[PDB]
Design an enzyme around this catalytic site. Structure first.
Site, PDB file in Angstrom:
ATOM      1  N   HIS A  38       3.318  45.828 -17.267  1.00 29.44           N
ATOM      2  CA  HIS A  38       1.935  45.418 -17.069  1.00 29.44           C
ATOM      3  C   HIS A  38       1.327  44.813 -18.322  1.00 29.44           C
ATOM      4  O   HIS A  38       0.198  44.325 -18.269  1.00 29.44           O
ATOM      5  CB  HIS A  38       1.072  46.579 -16.557  1.00 29.44           C
ATOM      6  N   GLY A 140      -6.918  56.161 -25.701  1.00 29.67           N
ATOM      7  CA  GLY A 140      -6.602  54.958 -26.437  1.00 29.67           C
ATOM      8  C   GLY A 140      -5.189  54.889 -26.965  1.00 29.67           C
ATOM      9  O   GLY A 140      -4.909  54.068 -27.845  1.00 29.67           O
ATOM     10  N   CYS A 142      -1.506  53.732 -27.455  1.00 30.72           N
ATOM     11  CA  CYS A 142      -0.809  52.481 -27.203  1.00 30.72           C
ATOM     12  C   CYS A 142       0.504  52.693 -26.460  1.00 30.72           C
ATOM     13  O   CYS A 142       1.249  51.729 -26.255  1.00 30.72           O
ATOM     14  CB  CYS A 142      -0.571  51.714 -28.517  1.00 30.72           C
TER      15      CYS A 142
END
Ligand code: NA
Lengths: 298, 302
Positions: A38, A140, A142
């Site tokens: 994605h 948040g 990664c």
């Protein structure tokens, strides 16, 4: 105290992958970088992504891969299920001996979590029965890569793809197959009601006995069927004959038959801890597998 | 359900771990530049450990009595000296994997990661705090070869702990990297036990603030407390006293959330009285005390 595997061998494989404005973590093994597919989607793509069509519209120049301050030039790309594979022009010199494996719910592994664009923390976890992973409360991320180490061989088993509303994450194996009924599309998704990993709790009770914590042992032995009737009531996973077999070594080591320990657990569920602890804990632990206990408690 | 604490990635420390053997005793050492640091009791036999005279044992050692192995490579020792309870072996090679590093001595309540060695190699990593009684809560610790404790702040490794002894309750005790013990313990196999442990109150309060910041509020109430009244109650639960320094330290979180520090103390007082009634805080069914204000402010002030 659960320990994670030392993460150094995986740290040498973590890279940053950028497509458009999206940057996330990738896994650099030999001359291939693996990451969630994605990464190629925009905000609007995610509502109904045609990944095969989106990928053919992409070119090698659309991908920016950085290992530290060194850029890796992408020279080809393909998709395997939900994982994007970026062929790069440089083989990772830090590639460990490794393989890709798929694990089962209830099995444990270490997660190397990436925050602020590089590996930031490591923790030990179990894949929940509902296929999610309890990660850090810190949002948040990664991305995350999950692994076990056997001798010098890193068995990669998990890559995070999404955060779920409840503070957990969901992901695939390294061949891009999801764990659990989740999709990499922007759509309403929720973790199912979770349950306690019964075979792991039993494994941990065995660890307690091996370490001399025995107050919870009783004279009784139950049946697999009678135990599961109680387990279901308390949102515990059903125990199977396979689980009983898996616990065999611990039964032989301690002299406590599995269905004997099940009767101890039944009583703990029905009556509580009665002000006592086990291995210093006031709660039952379900993130140690039988194999974890055998390995760490001889 | 406990709180998910992360350890620092251990790669930078793994590159420094070596095996140190003296006679039949093998344990973990830390190879930084051209020095290997390890517990001085590597020079002890089992007999020696009751009443070791380390100066007498060490004066009788030669460089070639020390076997140092970095993987399958043997490092040649070319000197040795004792600094408090740590032995320092000068080797003929500087470790090419030496990260940026410093030695720091920490205080009870501070957190750090531990790279544990088992069976002669780094085998596990976990996050912990130095307890108020100056011990570390380890893992099952069946046959540990030692442990090194560290933080990593912007690619600089701060080494703060080296394990020397396991205590009867399964916790371990050790020194800073200058060889000075944390707490009243000694590197001698004699009767010594950890004092009663206590909960790190300031850490619990910081973590409650982290919970409010992240949207958990069910445990707040409408009360406040004086600092002294709170300390009288907290100590009844074996919580550490809260100091004005602690109040100062929580200031930024109070300002971020709009909840006065002594108001959060009243909430903690109520949580100790009520329990959690099946609810969780930041996914945890336990009050967490191994997450410091420094880390909360860092990971939540954003
Ligand atoms: Na029983």
């Amino acid at each position: 105290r659960k320990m994670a595997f030392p993460s150094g061998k995986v740290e040498g494989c973590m890279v940053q992958v950028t497509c458009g404005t999206t940057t996330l973590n990738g896994l650099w093994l030999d001359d291939v970088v693996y990451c969630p597919r994605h990464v190629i989607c925009t905000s609007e793509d995610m509502l109904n992504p045609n990944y095969e069509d989106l990928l053919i519209r992409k070119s090698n120049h659309n991908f920016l891969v950085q290992a530290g301050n060194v850029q890796l030039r992408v020279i080809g790309h393909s998709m395997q299920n939900c994982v994007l594979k970026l062929k790069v022009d440089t083989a990772n010199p830090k590639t460990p001996k490794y393989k890709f494996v798929r694990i089962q719910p209830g099995q444990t592994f270490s997660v190397l979590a990436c925050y602020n664009g590089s590996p930031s923390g490591v923790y030990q976890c179990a894949m929940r029965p509902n296929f999610t992973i309890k990660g850090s409360f810190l949002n948040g991320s990664c991305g995350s890569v999950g692994f076990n180490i056997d001798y010098d061989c890193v068995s990669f088993c998990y890559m995070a793809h999404m955060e779920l509303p409840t503070g957990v994450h969901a992901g695939t194996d390294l061949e891009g197959n999801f764990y659990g009924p989740f999709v990499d599309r922007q759509t309403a998704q929720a973790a199912g009601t979770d349950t306690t990993i019964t075979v792991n709790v039993l494994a941990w009770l065995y660890a307690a006995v091996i370490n001399g914590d025995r107050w919870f042992l009783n004279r009784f032995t139950t049946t697999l069927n009678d135990f599961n009737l109680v387990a279901m009531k308390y949102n515990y996973e059903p125990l199977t004959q396979d689980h009983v077999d898996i616990l065999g070594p611990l039964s032989a080591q301690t002299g406590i038959a599995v269905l004997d320990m099940c009767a101890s657990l039944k009583e703990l569920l029905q009556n509580g801890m009665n002000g006592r602890t086990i291995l210093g804990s006031a709660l039952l632990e379900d993130e140690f597998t039988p194999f974890d206990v055998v390995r760490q408690c001889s």
